Write an enzyme that holds these catalytic residues in place. Structure first.
Site, short mmCIF file in Angstrom:
data_model
loop_
_atom_site.label_atom_id
_atom_site.label_comp_id
_atom_site.label_asym_id
_atom_site.label_seq_id
_atom_site.Cartn_x
_atom_site.Cartn_y
_atom_site.Cartn_z
N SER A 105 0.76 -1.28 0.00
CA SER A 105 0.00 0.00 0.00
C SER A 105 0.77 1.30 0.00
O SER A 105 0.42 2.23 -0.70
CB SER A 105 -1.05 0.02 1.10
OG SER A 105 -0.52 -0.49 2.31
N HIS B 270 -4.73 -4.15 -2.57
CA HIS B 270 -4.42 -3.00 -3.40
C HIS B 270 -4.20 -3.39 -4.84
O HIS B 270 -3.46 -2.71 -5.58
CB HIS B 270 -3.22 -2.30 -2.84
CG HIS B 270 -3.53 -1.61 -1.58
ND1 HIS B 270 -4.11 -0.35 -1.56
CD2 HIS B 270 -3.54 -2.06 -0.30
CE1 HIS B 270 -4.38 -0.02 -0.31
NE2 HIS B 270 -4.06 -1.04 0.47
N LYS C 26 -12.05 -0.94 -1.77
CA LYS C 26 -11.08 -0.09 -2.44
C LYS C 26 -11.47 0.09 -3.96
O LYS C 26 -12.44 0.83 -4.24
CB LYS C 26 -9.57 -0.44 -2.04
CG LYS C 26 -9.27 -0.26 -0.44
CD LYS C 26 -7.81 -0.57 0.20
CE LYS C 26 -7.87 -0.51 1.82
NZ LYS C 26 -6.56 -0.32 2.74
C1 SCA Z 1 7.72 0.18 11.71
C2 SCA Z 1 6.56 -0.79 11.48
C3 SCA Z 1 7.01 -1.89 10.51
C4 SCA Z 1 6.13 -1.41 12.82
O1 SCA Z 1 7.15 -1.27 13.82
P1 SCA Z 1 6.88 -1.71 15.35
O2 SCA Z 1 7.98 -1.18 16.19
O3 SCA Z 1 5.48 -1.39 15.71
O4 SCA Z 1 7.03 -3.32 15.28
P2 SCA Z 1 7.18 -4.19 16.63
O5 SCA Z 1 7.26 -3.28 17.79
O6 SCA Z 1 8.25 -5.19 16.42
O7 SCA Z 1 5.77 -4.97 16.69
C5 SCA Z 1 5.50 -5.92 17.72
C6 SCA Z 1 5.21 -7.34 17.47
O8 SCA Z 1 4.82 -7.26 16.10
C7 SCA Z 1 5.64 -8.18 15.33
N1 SCA Z 1 5.79 -7.83 13.89
C8 SCA Z 1 6.30 -6.69 13.36
N2 SCA Z 1 6.30 -6.73 12.00
C9 SCA Z 1 5.78 -7.91 11.64
C10 SCA Z 1 5.48 -8.59 10.36
N3 SCA Z 1 5.74 -8.02 9.17
N4 SCA Z 1 4.95 -9.84 10.43
C11 SCA Z 1 4.68 -10.45 11.61
N5 SCA Z 1 4.92 -9.88 12.81
C12 SCA Z 1 5.46 -8.64 12.88
C13 SCA Z 1 7.01 -8.20 16.01
O9 SCA Z 1 7.71 -9.46 15.87
C14 SCA Z 1 6.66 -7.85 17.44
O10 SCA Z 1 6.89 -8.98 18.28
P3 SCA Z 1 8.35 -9.05 19.01
O11 SCA Z 1 8.83 -7.59 19.06
O12 SCA Z 1 7.97 -9.65 20.35
O13 SCA Z 1 9.20 -9.93 18.13
C15 SCA Z 1 5.38 -0.03 10.87
O14 SCA Z 1 5.58 0.15 9.47
C16 SCA Z 1 4.09 -0.83 11.09
O15 SCA Z 1 3.97 -1.58 12.06
N6 SCA Z 1 3.15 -0.65 10.17
C17 SCA Z 1 1.85 -1.33 10.22
C18 SCA Z 1 1.68 -2.22 8.99
C19 SCA Z 1 1.52 -1.39 7.72
O16 SCA Z 1 2.37 -1.43 6.83
N7 SCA Z 1 0.41 -0.66 7.65
C20 SCA Z 1 0.10 0.19 6.49
C21 SCA Z 1 -1.34 -0.05 6.05
S1 SCA Z 1 -1.96 1.19 4.86
C22 SCA Z 1 -3.47 1.64 5.63
O17 SCA Z 1 -4.28 0.76 5.93
C23 SCA Z 1 -3.77 3.11 5.92
C24 SCA Z 1 -3.99 3.56 6.84
C25 SCA Z 1 -4.11 4.86 7.63
O18 SCA Z 1 -3.08 5.46 7.99
O19 SCA Z 1 -5.24 5.30 7.92
C1 PLP Z 2 -6.49 -0.90 4.02
C2 PLP Z 2 -5.97 -2.34 3.94
C3 PLP Z 2 -6.66 -3.46 4.44
C4 PLP Z 2 -7.96 -3.32 5.08
O1 PLP Z 2 -9.02 -3.47 4.12
P1 PLP Z 2 -10.47 -3.13 4.63
O2 PLP Z 2 -11.38 -3.88 3.75
O3 PLP Z 2 -10.50 -1.65 4.45
O4 PLP Z 2 -10.34 -3.64 6.04
C5 PLP Z 2 -6.20 -4.78 4.29
N1 PLP Z 2 -4.99 -5.01 3.67
C6 PLP Z 2 -4.27 -3.93 3.17
C7 PLP Z 2 -2.95 -4.24 2.51
C8 PLP Z 2 -4.76 -2.58 3.31
O5 PLP Z 2 -4.15 -1.58 2.89
#
Ligand code: SCA
Ligand code: PLP
Ligand code: SCA
Ligand code: PLP
Lengths: 399, 398
Positions: free
Chosen positions: B189, B217, B248
């Protein structure tokens, strides 16, 4: 490693416990609730009466709800097109959150795509906001609550259902410096009984705990404005966080929490379940807002009065047929069968013989040995509808 | 404790990291996308252009989607009134599930109230169906996937983003008898890059692992029928479980998984997230079904071709202007600012000074230091519109 074998094992396990669920394909007839078309597995169509639905007041067909929905579709389209942060925040969501805040007389409200998500996200997120939080949970709390409570590691205590003496014994034994939260329901979905709100609030005040109440099976239905059981008992100001649904009595879809602006802002800023998901379609928010607003009025009271009475009449007529059903005094009418296969056997007979649709309830929705039918009389289950159902039940049981 | 103090500390913490999010109250104008009305915090109304939305193809205003929704409201009412088990299963859900099954050429599909819920419920429930499952997860997997993967206790392995060498290294080190599943995205995304589907599938086949792809996406947008990147590369048959969204490119709401009948029935029967929640409103199912069905046609292809080209043009014009723009060849156009407070300022100016709406993206949606603007050109972002934005960014910038 044969994945298909494991899948088959997991499925077979359901059949062996007699708890494999067969869904019933229906289409409710807008303007004629509680009538619906049953799409039989053999391709046929049959007119039926829904007796186990959760649109408790028939708001799903209310002209003011539908007008608001049709209007929103025309104004802004089918969905929001985004998460709350990325373009998905609309005036429809703000209005709805204000409407909900007003309902519970709280500073703020936060809308999730379901009460399930609301419970799961909020309970888990509170563990992050209050390091060392101990959560005390009623043994019969809903799955969503249990899920939220366990999701993140951290102390939990399960108290015996409705047992305030057990609650206090558990809490007095805990570290007196630890943040505490007590989580329970106002109306329990399957028994239809009431949580002892005043007593729990008393315990929470004595031991400095937050109170978290799920009023999902109460909102729209209890209290002079449909705000729930705490409103009914004048206890809303003693509740820290309310959890509710827009999908039952309100007749649409989605859920929420209501609490102080501080509480709402922290949750919305920290809960992955809120942040990373598309916001509710504007039309849903439009419909739900109209529903809440309507049920706050004297006209809403009429629906609640009618529901209460239909429930009262149904229970009376069922006991009179020599049928003990435990009447905890709510709108939910459970008939306990006590075995999942008998429960489905009986439900099959009502459906086919009489057109009475009442889904058989088994594990994990209810504890094993307590499987049951769950009648939900609404304002649209008129006095002749009721008479229809009782004669069906009588004729059935005369086998 | 004092609960109010802790809440304040938690909120203050957001401000200190410059990541406290301010939402923008808007109302999209059906029939005139991407135009919307911005409801300013001062009570005023302003016409704006949405540039960061996820209704990627403008299906949210499509007459066939809306017709189906209006029709359903009239036929069966506002909601389903139940969970799938307790009266919430309708012909609208069956048809939708079949429509999705067909899209991904799978035996079955399961509809959840969002792709988030679908990922969270499925990934966690799989640990229950396959005792000892090891899940290998791309470091940039979506939150919902991460949430599902950790929910229940059990082994997880995080591989460096897109790094198949690292994936293989991790998997070869694990017990060769353990059930394994690899979970990744087709389009990520925030970077807008592509997952290496063929290479992952190759690794999966070699080590006997299930493949789980989130095409959220991508569905509606890639492949000849809008089935996604795996369809585009002819790899759909090598994927065990698809995860998708209806919210989406499809323009409505809700999510799903698609997989074998066995897989779907197991998940449906064991996942609390599926079991204990009201089913999607029949109108939502009606609208989504119409959307998928439409995008499968040659007319849908027209929308994909238009989106691809508008994206191509926007990136060309922005490189031309010297913007810090990452181009991994998808429809997502990210401009990296690298600081959450400047990302807000640039975005604020863009909105109030030029009627351009592009939300500032910060942690935890993207890693700290990589905060950015994320442009999403759609078929309704015509050549004139694009010209409008570039002129605005140029003037900025300054
Ligand atoms: C920097 C990161 C990568 C996250 O960093 P963090 O410091 O929170 O990670 P953390 O503290 O290690 O997280 C804690 C527990 O989660 C686990 N963990 C972390 N990344 C993982 C992965 N890819 N797969 C599986 N587990 C995972 C770790 O092992 C950890 O356990 P241990 O520490 O015990 O090992 C950030 O990018 C993130 O978390 N993003 C969320 C995902 C994403 O890409 N979302 C975008 C969606 S786009 C969207 O929907 C839009 C939204 C909007 O803004 O409105
Ligand atoms: C936003 C997002 C979701 C969540 O989809 P919803 O139907 O809005 O819950 C799931 N996966 C990815 C990669 C996304 O960006
Ligand atoms: C089986 C039980 C009874 C509990 O044992 P389980 O089978 O979960 O065993 P397990 O999962 O290994 O153990 C449960 C885990 O969750 C915890 N746990 C169990 N009950 C809890 C409670 N009331 N509060 C907090 N936590 C609880 C345990 O400590 C344990 O966590 P640790 O191991 O980590 O300590 C549960 O599944 C259950 O009966 N749930 C009922 C759900 C419910 O109330 N549904 C309402 C339906 S209303 C509805 O929507 C209808 C739906 C429909 O059918 O369509
Ligand atoms: C107490 C309780 N809370 C929450 C839910 C789920 O509500 P929603 O349909 O809004 O997800 C259920 C309903 O099945 C319930 O029994």
């Amino acid at each position: 490693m044969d994945y298909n074998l494991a899948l088959d094992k997991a499925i077979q396990k359901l059949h062996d416990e007699g708890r494999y669920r067969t869904f019933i394909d229906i289409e409710r007839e807008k303007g004629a609730f509680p009538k619906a078309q049953w799409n039989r597995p053999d391709g046929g169509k049959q007119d039926i009466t829904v007796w186990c639905g959760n649109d408790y007041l028939g708001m799903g067909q209310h002209p003011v709800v539908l007008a608001a929905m049709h209007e929103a579709l025309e104004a802004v389209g089918a969905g929001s097109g985004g998460t709350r942060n990325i373009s998905g925040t609309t005036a429809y969501h703000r209005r709805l959150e204000a409407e909900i805040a007003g309902l519970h007389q709280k500073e703020a409200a936060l809308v999730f795509s379901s009460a399930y998500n609301a419970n799961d996200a909020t309970l888990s997120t509170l563990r992050v906001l209050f390091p060392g939080l101990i959560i005390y949970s009623d043994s019969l709390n809903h799955a969503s609550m249990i899920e939220g409570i366990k999701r993140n590691a951290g102390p939990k205590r399960i108290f015996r259902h409705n047992d305030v003496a057990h609650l206090r014994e558990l809490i007095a034994a805990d570290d007196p410096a630890a943040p505490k939260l007590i989580a329970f329901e106002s109306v329990y979905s399957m028994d239809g009984d009431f949580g002892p709100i005043k007593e729990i609030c008393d315990i929470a005040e004595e031991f400095g705990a937050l109170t978290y109440i799920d009023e999902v099976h109460a909102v729209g239905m209890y209290g002079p404005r449909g705000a729930g059981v705490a409103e009914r008992d004048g206890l809303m100001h003693r509740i820290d966080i309310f959890n509710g649904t827009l999908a039952k009595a309100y007749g649409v879809f989605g859920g929420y929490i209501a609490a102080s602006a501080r509480m709402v802002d922290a949750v919305r800023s920290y809960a992955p379940g809120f942040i990373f998901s598309t916001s509710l379609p504007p039309a849903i928010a439009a419909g739900a807002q109209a529903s809440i607003a309507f049920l706050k009025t004297a006209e809403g009271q009429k629906l609640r009065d009618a529901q209460q009475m239909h429930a009262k009449v149904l229970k009376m007529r069922l006991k009179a047929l020599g049928m003990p059903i435990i009447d905890h005094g709510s709108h939910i009418v459970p008939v306990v069968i006590g075995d999942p296969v008998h429960t489905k056997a009986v439900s099959d007979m009502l459906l086919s013989d009489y057109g009475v649709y009442v889904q058989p309830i088994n594990f994990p929705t209810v504890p094993r040995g307590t499987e049951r039918l769950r009648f939900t009389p609404s304002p649209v289950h008129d006095l002749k509808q009721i008479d229809g159902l009782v004669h069906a039940m009588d004729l059935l049981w005369a086998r």
